[PDB]
Amino acid sequence: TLDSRMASLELVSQRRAAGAATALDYQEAVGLAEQARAERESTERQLR
Amino acid sequence: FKAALSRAQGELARAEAQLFQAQAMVRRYEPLVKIDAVSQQDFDNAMAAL
Amino acid sequence: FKAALSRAQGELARAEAQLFQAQAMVRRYEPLVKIDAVSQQDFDNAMAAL
Amino acid sequence: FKAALSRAQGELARAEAQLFQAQAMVRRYEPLVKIDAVSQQDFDNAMAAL
Amino acid sequence: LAATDTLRREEAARQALAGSSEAAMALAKARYEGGVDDYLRYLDAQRS
């Protein structure tokens, strides 16, 4: 899931770089990636 | 001919109102695109509309 | 000629209906934009439509 | 005749504005569609618009 | 130890997320003061 989030984040980053997307979309993609990372940390803690 | 002139002036007023709207849109969008608040595509559409 | 006048009057009636709608929209937006209930872009669009 | 030419030039200027906008759209979409950032359908729509 | 490590990384992710929402604040406020977005969008961003 996090790999998917980073893929979407990179893709939206490219779209913003090309100007087809606002910085708001890039920011929300960043937030989603951070949320997935936090979820991964929680699952890592549970596994440990 | 006065009636035709009135019609032409009415069309002119409509076009001028649309132009004022487009000018306002571009004036508002210009600083926003500088900080990427609006997409470069949206600003280009606004400029084309203007 | 009577039919042509009737057609033109129909077109004028449609234009008056559109004007009435735009007037009502601007009247509703005018107090709202002062408290920022509607975006300044939307108010300027309403004014342009009027 | 000068007025007719001015009107035609205005129409041409509008067409050039639309062409410029479409060119910008396609220029932005062309690198994006290769990485599948935009749908192939959207790129074909942009090409059709251009 | 596992909790402390995973929680350090999780707090890093959550701090990045908060920074992202604050960037959304900067952008939404800039739009609102620019007259493009109404107050509702700005308030929604604030709540987020």
Tab-separated table of C-alpha atoms in Angstrom:
chain	number	residue	atom	x	y	z
A	1	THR	CA	0.000	0.000	0.000
A	2	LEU	CA	2.829	2.410	0.812
A	3	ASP	CA	4.529	1.561	-2.472
A	4	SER	CA	1.260	2.449	-4.184
A	5	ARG	CA	1.110	5.722	-2.256
A	6	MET	CA	4.652	6.646	-3.252
A	7	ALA	CA	3.897	5.779	-6.877
A	8	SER	CA	0.866	8.071	-6.846
A	9	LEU	CA	2.877	10.749	-5.047
A	10	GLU	CA	5.623	10.653	-7.666
A	11	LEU	CA	3.048	10.714	-10.449
A	12	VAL	CA	1.247	13.727	-8.970
A	13	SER	CA	4.622	15.373	-8.405
A	14	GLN	CA	5.313	14.965	-12.110
A	15	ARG	CA	1.880	16.355	-12.969
A	16	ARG	CA	2.482	19.427	-10.813
A	17	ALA	CA	5.929	19.818	-12.349
A	18	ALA	CA	4.295	19.817	-15.778
A	19	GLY	CA	1.735	22.327	-14.509
A	20	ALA	CA	-1.363	20.184	-15.025
A	21	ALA	CA	-1.972	19.932	-11.259
A	22	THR	CA	-2.168	22.468	-8.461
A	23	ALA	CA	0.099	22.408	-5.441
A	24	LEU	CA	-2.965	21.395	-3.424
A	25	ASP	CA	-3.053	18.014	-5.144
A	26	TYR	CA	0.651	17.531	-4.525
A	27	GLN	CA	0.147	18.411	-0.860
A	28	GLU	CA	-2.741	15.999	-0.394
A	29	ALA	CA	-0.749	13.249	-2.112
A	30	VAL	CA	2.110	13.985	0.283
A	31	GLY	CA	-0.285	13.757	3.205
A	32	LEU	CA	-1.616	10.431	1.962
A	33	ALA	CA	1.916	9.058	1.622
A	34	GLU	CA	2.738	10.217	5.151
A	35	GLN	CA	-0.437	8.574	6.434
A	36	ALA	CA	0.538	5.298	4.782
A	37	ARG	CA	4.015	5.553	6.306
A	38	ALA	CA	2.518	6.070	9.760
A	39	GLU	CA	0.309	3.038	9.186
A	40	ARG	CA	3.373	1.014	8.199
A	41	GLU	CA	5.156	2.100	11.369
A	42	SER	CA	2.143	1.020	13.416
A	43	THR	CA	2.099	-2.405	11.776
A	44	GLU	CA	5.871	-2.736	12.242
A	45	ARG	CA	5.436	-2.005	15.923
A	46	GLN	CA	2.676	-4.606	16.147
A	47	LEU	CA	4.824	-7.220	14.406
A	48	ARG	CA	7.805	-6.548	16.661
B	1	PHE	CA	-30.492	52.475	-38.282
B	2	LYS	CA	-30.655	53.779	-34.729
B	3	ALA	CA	-32.158	50.422	-33.752
B	4	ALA	CA	-29.351	48.546	-35.499
B	5	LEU	CA	-26.877	50.787	-33.688
B	6	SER	CA	-28.567	49.965	-30.389
B	7	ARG	CA	-28.267	46.259	-31.156
B	8	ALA	CA	-24.591	46.618	-32.022
B	9	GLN	CA	-23.964	48.591	-28.831
B	10	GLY	CA	-25.760	45.920	-26.827
B	11	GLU	CA	-23.521	43.250	-28.305
B	12	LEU	CA	-20.565	45.503	-27.515
B	13	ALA	CA	-21.704	45.855	-23.909
B	14	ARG	CA	-22.035	42.089	-23.579
B	15	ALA	CA	-18.548	41.551	-24.991
B	16	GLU	CA	-17.155	44.246	-22.698
B	17	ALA	CA	-18.769	42.644	-19.651
B	18	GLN	CA	-17.243	39.303	-20.580
B	19	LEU	CA	-13.887	41.034	-21.059
B	20	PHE	CA	-14.086	42.646	-17.628
B	21	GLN	CA	-14.830	39.257	-16.090
B	22	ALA	CA	-11.866	37.670	-17.859
B	23	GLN	CA	-9.561	40.512	-16.822
B	24	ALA	CA	-10.608	40.095	-13.201
B	25	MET	CA	-10.086	36.337	-13.395
B	26	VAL	CA	-6.573	36.755	-14.776
B	27	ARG	CA	-5.691	39.468	-12.254
B	28	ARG	CA	-6.705	37.183	-9.402
B	29	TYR	CA	-5.046	34.111	-10.891
B	30	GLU	CA	-1.722	35.793	-11.664
B	31	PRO	CA	-0.248	35.903	-8.121
B	32	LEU	CA	-1.757	32.511	-7.288
B	33	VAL	CA	-0.001	30.666	-10.104
B	34	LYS	CA	3.290	32.182	-8.942
B	35	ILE	CA	2.991	30.134	-5.735
B	36	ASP	CA	1.304	27.208	-7.554
B	37	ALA	CA	-2.019	27.813	-5.784
B	38	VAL	CA	-3.668	27.350	-9.186
B	39	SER	CA	-2.486	24.959	-11.852
B	40	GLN	CA	-0.437	26.410	-14.668
B	41	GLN	CA	-3.061	24.817	-16.901
B	42	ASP	CA	-5.829	26.766	-15.171
B	43	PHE	CA	-3.912	30.015	-15.572
B	44	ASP	CA	-3.309	29.247	-19.244
B	45	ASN	CA	-7.025	28.626	-19.698
B	46	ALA	CA	-7.731	31.928	-17.953
B	47	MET	CA	-5.266	33.763	-20.184
B	48	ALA	CA	-6.811	32.181	-23.274
B	49	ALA	CA	-10.234	33.257	-22.036
B	50	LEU	CA	-8.917	36.794	-21.583
C	1	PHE	CA	-44.908	41.338	-40.154
C	2	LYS	CA	-47.154	40.568	-37.194
C	3	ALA	CA	-45.517	37.146	-36.972
C	4	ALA	CA	-42.048	38.697	-37.145
C	5	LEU	CA	-42.949	41.057	-34.315
C	6	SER	CA	-44.289	38.113	-32.309
C	7	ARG	CA	-41.018	36.246	-32.830
C	8	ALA	CA	-38.966	39.261	-31.784
C	9	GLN	CA	-41.168	39.734	-28.732
C	10	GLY	CA	-40.576	36.107	-27.817
C	11	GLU	CA	-36.831	36.651	-28.039
C	12	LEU	CA	-37.155	39.773	-25.885
C	13	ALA	CA	-39.223	37.842	-23.350
C	14	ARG	CA	-36.495	35.218	-23.124
C	15	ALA	CA	-33.868	37.926	-22.657
C	16	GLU	CA	-35.962	39.508	-19.905
C	17	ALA	CA	-36.305	36.139	-18.181
C	18	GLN	CA	-32.533	35.715	-18.265
C	19	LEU	CA	-32.063	39.252	-16.943
C	20	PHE	CA	-34.523	38.577	-14.133
C	21	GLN	CA	-32.622	35.448	-13.147
C	22	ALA	CA	-29.285	37.271	-13.188
C	23	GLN	CA	-30.694	40.160	-11.154
C	24	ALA	CA	-31.999	37.762	-8.523
C	25	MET	CA	-28.663	35.949	-8.396
C	26	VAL	CA	-26.718	39.178	-7.919
C	27	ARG	CA	-29.179	40.374	-5.283
C	28	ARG	CA	-28.631	37.166	-3.340
C	29	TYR	CA	-24.853	37.229	-3.766
C	30	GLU	CA	-24.379	40.885	-2.814
C	31	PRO	CA	-24.958	40.487	0.953
C	32	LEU	CA	-23.202	37.125	0.961
C	33	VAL	CA	-19.947	38.283	-0.625
C	34	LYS	CA	-19.581	40.957	2.061
C	35	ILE	CA	-19.363	38.208	4.688
C	36	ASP	CA	-17.285	36.077	2.277
C	37	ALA	CA	-20.024	33.458	2.030
C	38	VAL	CA	-19.404	33.279	-1.729
C	39	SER	CA	-16.061	33.632	-3.441
C	40	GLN	CA	-15.125	36.966	-4.965
C	41	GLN	CA	-14.697	35.104	-8.251
C	42	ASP	CA	-18.286	33.881	-8.038
C	43	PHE	CA	-19.606	37.357	-7.293
C	44	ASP	CA	-17.712	38.848	-10.212
C	45	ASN	CA	-19.068	36.067	-12.414
C	46	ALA	CA	-22.576	36.907	-11.207
C	47	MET	CA	-22.012	40.592	-11.956
C	48	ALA	CA	-20.694	39.712	-15.408
C	49	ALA	CA	-23.761	37.562	-16.025
C	50	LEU	CA	-25.995	40.435	-14.945
D	1	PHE	CA	-14.489	47.440	-45.366
D	2	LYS	CA	-11.932	48.498	-42.768
D	3	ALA	CA	-14.455	47.589	-40.078
D	4	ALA	CA	-15.102	44.218	-41.715
D	5	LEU	CA	-11.375	43.511	-41.772
D	6	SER	CA	-11.126	44.540	-38.116
D	7	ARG	CA	-13.949	42.160	-37.201
D	8	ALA	CA	-12.327	39.326	-39.142
D	9	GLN	CA	-9.003	40.065	-37.462
D	10	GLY	CA	-10.718	39.881	-34.091
D	11	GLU	CA	-12.102	36.467	-34.987
D	12	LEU	CA	-8.637	35.357	-36.105
D	13	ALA	CA	-7.143	36.637	-32.855
D	14	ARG	CA	-9.639	34.577	-30.882
D	15	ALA	CA	-8.783	31.520	-32.971
D	16	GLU	CA	-5.081	32.113	-32.337
D	17	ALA	CA	-5.723	32.357	-28.603
D	18	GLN	CA	-7.577	29.045	-28.690
D	19	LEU	CA	-4.787	27.455	-30.731
D	20	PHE	CA	-2.192	28.722	-28.265
D	21	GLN	CA	-4.135	27.243	-25.363
D	22	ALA	CA	-4.484	23.888	-27.117
D	23	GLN	CA	-0.784	23.843	-27.993
D	24	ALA	CA	0.098	24.446	-24.351
D	25	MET	CA	-2.277	21.670	-23.288
D	26	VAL	CA	-0.710	19.178	-25.679
D	27	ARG	CA	2.822	20.232	-24.750
D	28	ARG	CA	2.059	19.583	-21.095
D	29	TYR	CA	0.228	16.310	-21.728
D	30	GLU	CA	2.851	14.836	-24.063
D	31	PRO	CA	5.483	14.050	-21.384
D	32	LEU	CA	2.781	13.055	-18.913
D	33	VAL	CA	1.007	10.499	-21.097
D	34	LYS	CA	4.279	8.624	-21.611
D	35	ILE	CA	4.460	7.971	-17.859
D	36	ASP	CA	0.680	7.376	-17.818
D	37	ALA	CA	0.135	10.444	-15.646
D	38	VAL	CA	-2.845	11.374	-17.836
D	39	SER	CA	-5.209	8.907	-19.437
D	40	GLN	CA	-4.619	7.972	-23.057
D	41	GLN	CA	-8.172	9.134	-23.738
D	42	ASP	CA	-7.389	12.561	-22.289
D	43	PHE	CA	-4.284	12.839	-24.447
D	44	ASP	CA	-6.269	11.936	-27.548
D	45	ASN	CA	-8.863	14.544	-26.581
D	46	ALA	CA	-6.082	17.112	-26.231
D	47	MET	CA	-4.697	16.134	-29.634
D	48	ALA	CA	-8.161	16.457	-31.157
D	49	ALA	CA	-8.544	19.881	-29.566
D	50	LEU	CA	-5.178	20.956	-30.955
E	1	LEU	CA	12.602	-0.445	22.381
E	2	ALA	CA	10.422	-1.553	19.477
E	3	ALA	CA	7.687	0.876	20.486
E	4	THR	CA	10.126	3.763	20.909
E	5	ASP	CA	11.775	3.195	17.529
E	6	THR	CA	8.540	2.707	15.610
E	7	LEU	CA	6.999	5.687	17.395
E	8	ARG	CA	9.927	7.938	16.542
E	9	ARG	CA	9.422	7.058	12.889
E	10	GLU	CA	5.642	7.399	13.224
E	11	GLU	CA	5.975	10.844	14.793
E	12	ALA	CA	8.315	11.833	11.981
E	13	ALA	CA	5.652	10.779	9.484
E	14	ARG	CA	2.920	12.586	11.413
E	15	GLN	CA	5.039	15.739	11.611
E	16	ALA	CA	5.500	15.579	7.846
E	17	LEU	CA	1.730	15.186	7.499
E	18	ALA	CA	1.094	18.198	9.732
E	19	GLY	CA	3.547	20.230	7.681
E	20	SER	CA	1.687	19.172	4.551
E	21	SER	CA	-1.640	20.313	5.977
E	22	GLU	CA	0.012	23.590	6.975
E	23	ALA	CA	1.225	24.054	3.405
E	24	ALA	CA	-2.381	23.463	2.397
E	25	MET	CA	-3.206	26.260	4.857
E	26	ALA	CA	-0.793	28.641	3.179
E	27	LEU	CA	-2.234	27.859	-0.245
E	28	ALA	CA	-5.906	27.922	0.767
E	29	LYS	CA	-5.459	31.192	2.645
E	30	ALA	CA	-3.642	32.691	-0.332
E	31	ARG	CA	-6.540	31.674	-2.559
E	32	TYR	CA	-9.154	33.018	-0.147
E	33	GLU	CA	-7.451	36.388	0.275
E	34	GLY	CA	-7.035	36.387	-3.485
E	35	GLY	CA	-10.786	36.160	-3.858
E	36	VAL	CA	-10.777	32.816	-5.667
E	37	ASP	CA	-11.996	30.516	-2.882
E	38	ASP	CA	-14.781	31.421	-0.496
E	39	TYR	CA	-14.489	31.308	3.277
E	40	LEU	CA	-15.936	27.782	3.362
E	41	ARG	CA	-12.900	26.294	1.622
E	42	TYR	CA	-10.532	28.140	3.947
E	43	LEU	CA	-12.410	26.956	7.029
E	44	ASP	CA	-12.468	23.386	5.727
E	45	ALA	CA	-8.717	23.542	5.249
E	46	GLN	CA	-8.361	24.869	8.805
E	47	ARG	CA	-10.361	21.970	10.203
E	48	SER	CA	-8.262	19.527	8.193
